[PDB]
Design a protein around this ligand. Sequence first.
Ligand SMILES: Nc1ncnc2c1ncn2[C@@H]1O[C@H](CSCC[C@H](N)C(=O)O)[C@@H](O)[C@H]1O
Ligand SMILES: CNc1cc(C)c(C(N)=O)c[n+]1C
Length: 247
Amino acid sequence: FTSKDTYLSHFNPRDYLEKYYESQILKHLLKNLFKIFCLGVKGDLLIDIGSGPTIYQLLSACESFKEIVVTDYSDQNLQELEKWLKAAPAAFDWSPVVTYVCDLEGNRVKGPEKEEKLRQAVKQVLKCDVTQSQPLGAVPLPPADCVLSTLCLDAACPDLPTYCRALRNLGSLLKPGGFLVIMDALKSSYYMIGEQKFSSLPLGREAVEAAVKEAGYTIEWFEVISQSYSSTMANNEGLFSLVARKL
Ligand SMILES: Nc1ncnc2c1ncn2[C@@H]1O[C@H](CSCC[C@H](N)C(=O)O)[C@@H](O)[C@H]1O
Ligand SMILES: CNc1cc(C)c(C(N)=O)c[n+]1C
């Protein structure tokens, strides 16, 4: 299984964004995140776990959370995030994704307004390791109202016991009754970024549900989509989305 130090050196954030941000999946993820945050889940603080170099998973969340903390294992990934946050020239063009979210939300606001709301919400950009009892290391944070994690845990966990432990580790960042939002690939053993291969833990819906209950959460809803990534990218059998609450 891919060692975590491989994410520091061999995960190219720009290439990842070019390759995936595939469109049918992105549309579905955006609809689900809009449903969760704008049509319910809210608070003062949301922690996004394994953010990578993406901002798409935060576009509807910034309407419901005063503060958003973005986290990842890779320093290169956080640097790419910060380029967009600081509106740098070499920052990735999220404008077609931003326009799509504005349409879903009833066309209340336009693209630049949406982007400014996200940039204002993101207060901290932090290093994280989901395999650690303290994922944020020595960095102190108030208990979060919500912990979000998109397409991370399958890639970060080498086996089912580590996956369950990672869910418990994420729980330590959550207030009692706090929400856990996870969206990830089903039965995927790898994913590609050009010629670079990355391992993935191939989990079915039953193993995901069991791990979440074992980790001390109650599931509110669980959705499975049949849509898989292109043959050239991965071997997944769809994706899942779940909303759970910490016991
Ligand atoms: N142990 C670990 N702890 C935290 N993040 C990890 C990790 N191992 C890998 N990652 C991160 O998991 C990410 C997978 S890519 C997912 C990126 C983004 N959330 C999206 O939805 O597209 C990478 O950014 C990688 O750096
Ligand atoms: C689009 N990003 C993806 C896609 C897939 C299919 C997997 C996986 N777990 O195989 C991981 N990431 C990060």
